[PDB]
Ligand binder design. Structure first.
Ligand SMILES: OC[C@H]1O[C@@H](O[C@H]2[C@H](O)[C@@H](O)[C@H](O)O[C@@H]2CO)[C@H](O)[C@@H](O)[C@H]1O
Ligand SMILES: OC[C@H]1O[C@@H](O[C@H]2[C@H](O)[C@@H](O)[C@H](O)O[C@@H]2CO)[C@H](O)[C@@H](O)[C@H]1O
Lengths: 134, 134
C-alpha cells in the first residue's frame, strides 16, 4: 500500500533522509509529514504532469476535516522519471528545511508550530528504497 | 498504535538499526520482521517477566492462519527497564544476524528462505526513537 514510517516520533532537531525511485510514466508523487492521511503539516508534491502543472514542486498543509491551505510553489525540479532521488528534511518550530538530491533547498513554514510528527509517508507514482530518521 | 516501517522493502544485504527505550515496568516487547501482524519471519521477544520467563530472549516465526513455529531461546539479555537499547539486523537467505546493544549476537534461521520483507514493527512495552534501514 503506501510506504510509511509510523509512531517513531520525528522531533525537533532530528533529520529524516528518504531515498527512492520515481516511476517511469509518473504523473506525481508526494512526501508527507504529519499525524494521519488527513492531517499533514508538510505535503511536498512532485508534479511531472498534473493538470497545468509540469515539472513543479507544490508544498502545502492539510487540516483534518477542513482541507488544503495556501500552496507554495517551487520551480526547482532535479527529478527524472525512472530515476533515484534523495531528500533530507529537518525542522524547527517555525520552518521545514528541505534539501533536494542536487543540493538545492526549499523552506516551508511550520504553520501549526508543531514539535513532533508521528507519520511520514510517500504516496503516488514512486517507491521508497531506504530511510534514516535519527 | 505500534511503531512500524511499512512498504520500504528490507532486502538481502540491507541493514536495519532501531533504537528505543524500554518502559519502566515492562513485561515484554518484541521486534518483528515479516509481511503482516499475522505473518512474521523473525519475532524477537524480550521478556522481563512473562509466565515463567524472566530476562530471556525468545525467537520464533509466525505463519499466517497457522501459528507459531519452534521457539529458540537465548539467555543474552543486556536490557534494563527504563533504559535505551539499540539493535541491528541483517540477513541472507539462510540466517538472520542480530546484534544487541552490548555487541553480543544472536542468529536465527530464515525459515521461509525469503529475500525481502515489507513490514518491521515493535509491539509491547517499549517505544522506538530512531530507525535506519539502508
Ligand atoms: O495544494 C496541494 C494539493 O493540491 C491539489 O491540487 C490543486 C492544485 O494544486 C491547484 O492548482 C488547483 O487550483 O486546485 C487543485 C485542487 O485543490 C491536489 O489535488 C492535492 O492532492 C494536493 O497536492
Ligand atoms: O514463540 C513466541 C510466542 O510465544 C508465545 O508464548 C508461548 C511461550 O513462549 C511458551 O513457553 C508457552 O509454552 O506457550 C506460549 C504460548 O504459545 C507468546 O504468547 C507469543 O506472543 C510469542 O511470543
Amino acid at each position: 500500500d503506501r510506504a510509511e514510517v509510523r509512531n517513531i516520533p520525528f522531533k525537533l532537531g532530528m533529520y529524516l533522509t528518504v531515498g527512492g525511485v520515481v516511476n517511469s510514466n509518473a504523473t506525481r508523487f508526494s512526501i508527507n509529514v504529519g499525524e494521519s492521511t488527513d492531517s499533514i503539516a508538510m505535503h511536498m508534491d512532485h508534479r511531472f504532469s498534473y493538470g497545468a502543472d509540469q515539472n513543479v514542486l507544490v508544498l502545502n498543509s492539510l487540516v483534518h476535516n477542513v482541507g488544503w491551505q495556501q500552496e507554495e510553489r517551487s520551480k526547482k525540479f532535479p527529478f527524472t522519471k525512472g530515476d533515484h532521488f534523495q531528500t533530507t528534511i529537518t525542522f524547527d518550530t517555525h520552518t521545514f528545511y528541505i534539501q533536494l538530491s542536487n543540493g538545492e533547498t526549499v523552506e516551508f513554514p511550520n504553520r501549526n508550530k508543531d514539535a513532533a510528527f508521528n507519520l511520514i509517508y510517500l504516496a503516488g507514482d514512486a517507491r521508497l528504497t531506504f530511510v534514516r530518521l535519527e
